[PDB]
């Protein structure tokens, strides 16, 4: 009856809270929660469409509802296929992120920090603010300019791009800035 | 508002050495964990030239021998190696709180081997004497250090009246201080004597240098 | 790069007003804010205020509020600063910077009720004591003028290696400065030497040549 | 009855479409549409909460629903107050963007392109890719490295920060990169 | 900065595998991919393949697939390349770069079944009719050795300027190179001269000094 | 596959001039509208040094006198001003498609004023003759240009058996070509004659420069 409306209101409140906090803060766990919510978004839409269709007032409404449900389902299946292809290529669990199918590997201090990249571009910039590193708008922890990675890479289905550190500048002692430019590509 | 107490009021360092300029803020100019403190230099007759901003950021085109440091209230500008063309006045400014205030400025003097003043005395122009006036000038060019005193003797009597001295700023071509002395008089006193001399006492020789002309051969 | 050309020196009587322009070139005028700075006594740099030439909202020093007003003319890319009710304290050099990097040449403002006077230039030829050395030292005595500044050059800009211009010294309400040039003994009186002085406040350009006694 | 569910499904579909296209593409009109949708999000939540409260099954559900509605309402009112303060300061219509209360003025080729900034930071980076400029992740049209603005500014309620161009590098001919570092602050 | 130190030269019989190490320093070994390059005949640079030392997945040239296998040892930061079924075609210098910027010094691989022979160094003292030069020039004849390379230095590294080392010439399965040093005529036999050769393959370091005839 | 074809196979330019190196691809190496084309420099006995990447990006620390240009299939490397230490081999590599291929390499030669070879003939060591062999070596140091022919003759009869020559690469300290000649023989032929002559014909003098020695004084 009204339970659907209440849960929808709670969902919108949660989305607002994540939006107003995850935008300013890029904590890894908050980021993962936002990813999980974004993934959940699709089944919510499918459930809404099917529930509207089953209680269709007239034939046209049910038909359009089921058509939209099928559209969302095929979109979800295609995105799952691409995600599984990316996982097979990179064998990393980050490939199943609902954001996209491009991964950014950052060899930071012994480990490699893989993050979803929204677009593979010729230039990716790095900015260090108060000692905290952000590459492609992703908080990768504490780092300083002198030990910044000299090479990163971006992994996509049937492609692998390698970047190298361009010019690196130091701003106000602890803050800083840098860029990563493509110099190589590897298919398969 | 804020007063940037810049120290020392004057500095003197030889070539190839390190020069340090201090600038203490009355209160912390820190904002969001960063201090906005520019550093300028101003050679004579020129607008200020920005060297540093945000207390450590070298301006584009400035030699890398200028370094900005410090934080909190105490800030510091370091010049290393002090070169030939660094004789200027250096200012500290805070671009943090309205009004943006400057420091009192400290002038950087370059130390150099002491030289002798090429003392040259000139007779008053007959062109000037056509107007009833006569000023004896005496150029003490290319000496070092700055301190130098001049004695004006007429007929052996020293004169302390009408002696105007005009130093120059330390040259950038060769880092020497030049001086000019002028002893103005109207024609009656000028022709009341014939012998004039410009004696310069400088701490590069035991006895003062003396240059003179007498009105007999004029 | 960017350029900032100001209005030349201006002598203004006490209790008056004047406008210091700062014409911009090499960049879109509305892009960057225009700061105004004042250097009094030659060392005391003081911030006046800044103007955003796009919308036109300013921000003055509370010490200079009511004394300076900042305006812009987007059509001719020239900013302005009007000094109100000038006083003996307002004699200084007023700079216009943009990003703290590109400055103007400085508008020297002299706030005095005294009269203008062109410089009565005189020559300085050596006597019989400086005629024995390898190279002759000649000079030009720019005497009795008002106000600052005066530009002394030798032979209309040819001689610049070994030229000393001694700052002026105010006395009896009239300034006075000397200039010296060191040239080899084979260049004088063999080659012409002229000390061309250009007093801007009086529209005077005296070109006097040194004649040996 | 089921109309609410169908409109909710359509809203989720529209949000997905904007998310998957506005992320890769930053067209000005698409950006404005996304801003309008994000603004609409709040009244949708308020309507859902009030509709749940009016048809409350039990007292506790209605009480919590009205409490959440009041919370959302006071949040909306406070954000409106901040937005109006920013507009009064800057007198620009961009100050009413639902994203935040920080504006980025970019003096680009005679005009000034004001965009909502999510955070005022000591360093803002600029990247030019194939001749298209992005500052703080905002497409500002075609530009090249040599004529890049030498000064930008960030406007906030009771503060105004001025940046200046740091080091600027050119990548692969047409692409490029640059940074903007704080050098001044102006209160009031 | 980064460093890449390889294994020295290796003489390998035909059809016998070998392993070329490339020890990394100055950076975390895992994080930069390691490329392998081959320069044959001294000018033909050929790409072999690259390995990601984190997960261990490689990518070879199809020409070198089955001929070269790339492995890593994260414990010692040492990358490896194993050449399978070597042939006379595989004699070359194998480099290891990381970001195309930092390279190794090159592992010279000689695929031959021939013997090894230390160099029978000889002195080259100018004759009594070879004083026309104002400064005496001496030399060392490194004769009849195998395989490449040979490190010819004069006076154990004292003389690093004015020295010519002439590349070897393979003849009769034995290499041969000469070296020349030009020193002032007042320096020899006034100061001792020694050509210290160092043939690595046979662990031979002959330090021969030139005596006037 | 791709085949980078460099041009010219060898180059020769004097100091202060501009050197242009071409590199044509069999097929376009564009990806997403960009060409990934590195340029390397390899001085003899040294690993390649990366100058340019992404066909226009100067490597960090490389003098800003190497410029990468071109697009599509035709690429180009320009060196200006060509300096004393640019004598090397320059390679073009495409980091676009597996396999990454290199160009054949072009050798950059530096033009310099022609000089004379300090010809010097050395007698075979008695140490070598202890083993039955004797090789006469003749060093032709610090000449230019590269082309030079050495004429060995004993007792007036020219010898062309066992004459092994070993040129050096163009020096970077002096930009000159040195050469070595070796006339190997066993003891019987060496003692069958006494006078040995090493003369070099070079286009810096009218006649060959002759150096010789015999066994009657050594
Ligand atoms: C773990 C798992 N997960 C998923 N899904 C996770 C979320 C989605 N997912 C990862 C996306 C989203 C986009 C996209 O939204 N792109 C929009 C465009 N981006 C924005 C601008 C440019 C780029 C693309 N690809 N994959 C769908 C797949 N399914 C299944 C069955 C399973 C179970 C397994 C173990 C069998
Ligand atoms: C035109 C108008 N508009 C609005 N609203 C527009 C949308 C909201 N709006 C602009 C925000 C959002 C945030 C935020 O969501 N911040 C979250 C934190 N950001 C993310 C990470 C850090 C920064 C903040 N401030 N204002 C609310 C106000 N109301 C009214 C009555 C009117 C009518 C007028 C003409 C009287």
Domain ranges of chain D: 3-96, 102-186
F142 within domain boundaries: yes
Contact B6, B89 (CB under 8 A): no
Q: C139 lies in a domain? A: yes
Position C66 in a domain: yes
Whether A72 and D177 lie within 8 Å, measured CB to CB: no
Q: Is D118 in the pocket of ligand 2 (CB under 6 A)?
A: yes
Q: Do E99 and A150 touch (CB under 8 A)?
A: yes
The closest of F171, F168, F180, F176 to F114, measured between CA atoms, is F176
Q: Are residues E129 and E76 in the same domain?
A: no
Quick check: is C116 in a domain? no
Rounded CA separation E71/F68 (Å): 35
User: What does DSSP assign to residue B85?
Assistant: G
Experimental method: cryo-EM
Beta-carbon separation of C164 and B104 below 8 A: no
CB distance A136 to D125 below 8 Å: no
Q: Are residues C44 and C14 in the same domain?
A: yes
Non-local CB neighbours of F177 within 8 Å, separated by 6+ positions: F143, F144, F145, F146, F148, F167, F168, F170, F171
3 state SS of D74: helix
Report residue D151 CA to chain centroid gap.
21
The 8-class DSSP code of residue D173 comes to T
- Ligand 2 atom with the smallest distance to the CA of A24 is 21
Query: Burial code of A83-120, b = ≥16 C-beta within 10 A, e = fewer?
Result: beebbebbeeebbbbbbbbbbbbbbbeeebbbbbbeeb
Q: How many CA atoms lie within 13 A of D164 on its CB side?
A: 21
Which of E111, E135, E160 is the C-terminal boundary of a domain?
E111
Can you give the CATH number for the domain in which F143 is found?
2.60.40.10
Shared-domain flag, residues E49 and E100: yes
User: Both tokens of residue E196?
Assistant: 């210290």
Name the nearest CA neighbour of C10 among C83, C108, C96. C108
Q: Which of C86, C111, C136 is the last residue of a domain?
A: C111
Which of the listed residues E83, E111, E139 is the one where a domain comes to its end? Answer: E111
* Beta carbons of B180 and C178 less than 8 angstroms apart: yes
Ligand (nearest to CA of A102) = 1
Asked if residue E117 is part of any domain, the answer here is no
Rounded CA separation B138/B129 (Å): 18
Measured at the CA of F188, the angle between CA F183 and CA F192, to 5 degrees, comes to 85
Contacts of A2 in chain D (CB under 8 A): 51-52, 55-57
How many angstroms separate the CA atoms of C93 and C37, rounded? 8
What does the alpha-carbon distance between residue A94 and residue D20 come to, in Å, rounded to a whole number? 18
**Both C7 and C87 in a single domain?**
yes
| Resolution of the solved structure (Å) | 3.2
If DSSP states are collapsed to H, E and C, what string results for chain E? CCEEEECCCEEECCCCCEEEEEEEECCCCCCCCEEEEEEECCCEEEEEEEECCCCCCEEECCCCECCEEEEEECCCCEEEEEECCCCHHHCEEEEEECCCCCCCCCEEEEECCCCCECCCCEEECCCCCCCCCCCCEEEEEEEEEECCCCEEEEHHHCECCCEEEECCCCECCEEEEEEEEECCCCCCCCCCCEEEEEECCCCECCEEECCCC
Q: Distance (Å, rounded) from C-alpha B168 to C-alpha F169? A: 59
Q: How far is CA D35 from CA D29, D38, D99, in A?
A: 10, 5, 7
Atom of ligand 2 nearest to the CA of A21: 21
Q: What residue's CA is closest to ligand 1, atom 20?
A: D20
A151 in Cβ contact with A163 (< 8 Å): yes
Return the SS3 of C78: strand
Cβ-proximal residues to C101 (8 Å cutoff; 6+ apart), any chain: B50, B59, C2, D164
Q: Which chain A residues touch B34 with a CB distance below 8 Å?
A: 172, 175
Q: Which residues of C166-177 are buried (b: 16+ CB within 10 A; e: fewer)?
A: bbbeeeeebbbb
F96 in contact with A, Cβ within 8 Å: yes
- Do F133 and F208 share a domain, yes or no? yes
- Asked if the peptide bond before residue C194 counts as cis, ω within 30 degrees of 0, the response is no
For chain E, the domain total comes to 2
Task: Please identify among residues 32-71 of chain B the ones whose CB lies closer than 8 Å to any CB of chain D.
Answer: 32, 34, 36, 38, 53-54, 57, 60
Assess whether the previous peptide bond of B8 is cis (omega < 30° from 0): yes
**Same domain as C99, residue C172:** no
For residue B192, tell me if it sits in a domain: yes
Is A38 close to ligand 1, i.e. is its CB under 6 Å away?
Answer: no
In chain D, after which residues does the backbone break, taking C–N over 2.5 angstroms as a break?
Answer: none
Beta partners for residue C165, in sequence order = C179
Same structural domain, F99 and F16: yes
Q: Where in chain B does DSSP place strands (E)?
A: 4-7, 10-14, 19-25, 30-31, 34-35, 37-42, 49-53, 57-58, 66-71, 74-79, 89-94, 106-111, 120-122, 133-143, 149-154, 157-159, 163-165, 177-186, 195-201, 209-214
Same domain, C37 and C60: yes
Indicate if ligand 2 lies below 6 Å from the C-beta of D35: no
Question: Dihedrals φ, ψ of D185, to 5°?
Answer: -140, 140
Task: Return d(Cα E29, Cα F107) in angstroms, integer.
Answer: 35
Q: Which CATH number fits the domain that encloses residue E49?
A: 2.60.40.10
Q: Within an 8 Å CB–CB cutoff, is residue A171 touching chain B?
A: yes
Q: How far is CA F163 from each of CA F152, F158, F207, rounded to the nearest angstrom?
A: 8, 11, 21
Q: Which residues of D touch F71 (CB under 8 A)?
A: 173
Residue B103 near residue B91 (C-beta atoms within 8 A): yes
CB contact under 8 Å between A107 and E30, yes or no, is yes
Q: Containing H/E element for F129?
A: helix F126-129
Domain assignment present for residue C117? The answer is no
Taking a C-beta distance cutoff of 8 angstroms, is the pair C33, C20 a contact? no
Last residue of some domain: B82, B110, B138? Answer: B110
Per-residue tokens: F21: 């190196």
| Region for residue F155 given its phi and psi (left: phi exceeds 0; alpha: psi -120 to 50; beta: otherwise) | left
Pairing verdict, β C107-111 and C10-12: parallel
Give the β-pairing of D132-135 and D123-129. antiparallel
Is the same domain home to F86 and F145?
Answer: no
Taking the alpha carbons at both ends of chain C, their separation in whole angstroms is 50
- Starting at the edge strand found earlier in the chain, the sheet holding F163-165 runs F120-122, F133-143, F177-186, F163-165
Full residue range of the structural domain in which residue F42 is found: 11-110
**Which chain A residues have a beta carbon less than 8 Å from that of D26?**
none
Interatomic CA distance for residues E61 and E109, integer angstroms: 19
Q: How many A from CA of B35 to the centre of ligand 2?
A: 32
Place of tokens 């190196």: F21
Give the up-direction half-sphere exposure of residue B190: CA atoms within 13 A in the CB hemisphere: 21
Q: Whole domain around residue E36: which residue ranges?
A: 3-111
- Residue D82 φ/ψ, nearest 5 degrees: -65, -40
CB C117 within 8 A of CB C204: no
Assess if residue E24 is contained within a domain: yes
Task: Give the gap in angstroms from C-alpha D107 to the nearest C-alpha of chain C.
Answer: 5
Same domain, F29 and F68: yes
Q: Of F89, F110, F131, at which residue does a domain stop? A: F110
- Between chain C and chain D, how many beta carbons pairs sit less than 8 Å apart? 35
SS3 A63: helix
Domain endpoint, select from F86, F110, F134: F110
Q: Residues for chain B: how many in total? A: 218
Q: What is the CA radius of gyration of chain A?
A: 21
Total domains in chain B come to 2
């Amino acid at each position: 009856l009204e339970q659907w409306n209440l849960v929808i209101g709670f969902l919108f409140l949660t989305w607002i809270c994540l939006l107003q906090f995850a935008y300013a803060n890029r904590n890894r766990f908050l980021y993962i929660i936002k990813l999980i919510f974004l993934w959940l978004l699709w089944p919510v839409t499918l459930a809404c469409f099917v529930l509207a269709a089953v209680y269709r007032i007239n034939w046209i409404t049910g038909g359009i509802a089921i058509a939209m449900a099928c559209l969302v389902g095929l979109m979800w299946l295609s995105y799952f296929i691409a995600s599984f292809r990316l996982f097979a290529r990179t064998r990393s669990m980050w490939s199943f992120n609902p954001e996209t199918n491009i991964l950014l590997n950052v060899p930071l201090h012994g480990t490699i920090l893989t993050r979803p990249l929204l677009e593979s571009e010729l230039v990716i910039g790095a900015v260090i603010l108060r000692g905290h590193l952000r590459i492609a708008g992703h908080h990768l922890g504490r780092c300083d300019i002198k030990d910044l990675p000299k090479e990163i890479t971006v992994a996509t289905s049937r492609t692998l791009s390698y970047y190298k550190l361009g010019a690196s500048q130091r701003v106000a002692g602890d803050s800083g800035f840098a860029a990563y430019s493509r110099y190589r590509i590897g298919n398969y | 508002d804020i007063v940037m107490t810049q120290s020392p009021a004057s500095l003197a360092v030889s070539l190839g050495q390190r020069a340090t300029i201090s600038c203490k803020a009355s209160q912390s100019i820190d904002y969001d964990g960063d201090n906005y403190m520019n550093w300028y230099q101003q050679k004579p007759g020129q607008p200020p030239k920005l060297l540093i901003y945000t207390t450590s950021n070298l301006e584009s085109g400035i030699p890398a021998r200028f370094s900005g440091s410090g934080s909190g209230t105490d800030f510091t500008l370091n010049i290393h190696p002090v070169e030939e063309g660094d004789a200027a006045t250096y200012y500290c400014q805070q671009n943090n709180e309205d009004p943006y205030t400057f420091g009192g400025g400290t002038k950087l003097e370059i130390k150099r081997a002491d030289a002798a003043p090429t003392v040259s005395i000139f007779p008053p122009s007959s062109e000037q004497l056509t107007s009833g006036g006569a000023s004896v000038v005496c150029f003490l060019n290319n000496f070092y250090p700055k301190d130098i005193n001049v004695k004006w003797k007429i007929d052996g009597s020293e004169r302390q009246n009408g002696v105007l001295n005009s130093w120059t700023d330390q040259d950038s071509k060769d880092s020497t201080y030049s001086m000019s002395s002028t002893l103005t008089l109207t024609k009656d006193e000028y022709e009341r004597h014939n012998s004039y001399t410009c004696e310069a006492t400088h701490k590069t020789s035991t006895s003062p240098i003396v240059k003179s002309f007498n009105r007999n051969e004029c | 790069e960017v350029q900032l050309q100001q209005s030349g020196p201006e002598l203004v009587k006490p209790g008056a007003s004047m406008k210091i322009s700062c014409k911009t070139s090499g960049y879109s005028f509305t892009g960057y804010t225009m700061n105004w700075v004042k250097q009094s006594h030659g060392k005391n740099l003081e911030w006046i205020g800044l103007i955003n030439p796009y919308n036109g909202d300013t921000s003055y020093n509370q010490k200079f509020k009511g004394k300076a007003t900042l305006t812009v003319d987007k059509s001719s890319s020239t900013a302005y600063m009007e000094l109100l009710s000038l006083t003996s304290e307002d004699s200084a050099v007023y700079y216009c910077e943009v990003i703290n990097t590109y400055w103007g040449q400085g508008t020297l403002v002299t706030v005095s009720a005294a009269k203008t006077t062109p410089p009565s230039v005189y020559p300085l030829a050596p006597g019989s004591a400086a005629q024995t050395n390898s190279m002759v030292t000649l000079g030009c005595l720019v005497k009795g003028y008002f106000p600052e500044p005066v530009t002394v050059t030798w032979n209309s800009g040819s001689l610049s290696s070994g030229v000393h211009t001694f700052p002026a010294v105010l006395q009896s309400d009239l300034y006075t400065l000397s200039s010296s040039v060191t040239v080899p003994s084979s260049t004088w009186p063999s080659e012409t030497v002229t000390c061309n002085v250009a007093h801007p406040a009086s529209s005077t350009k005296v070109d006097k040549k040194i004649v040996p006694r």
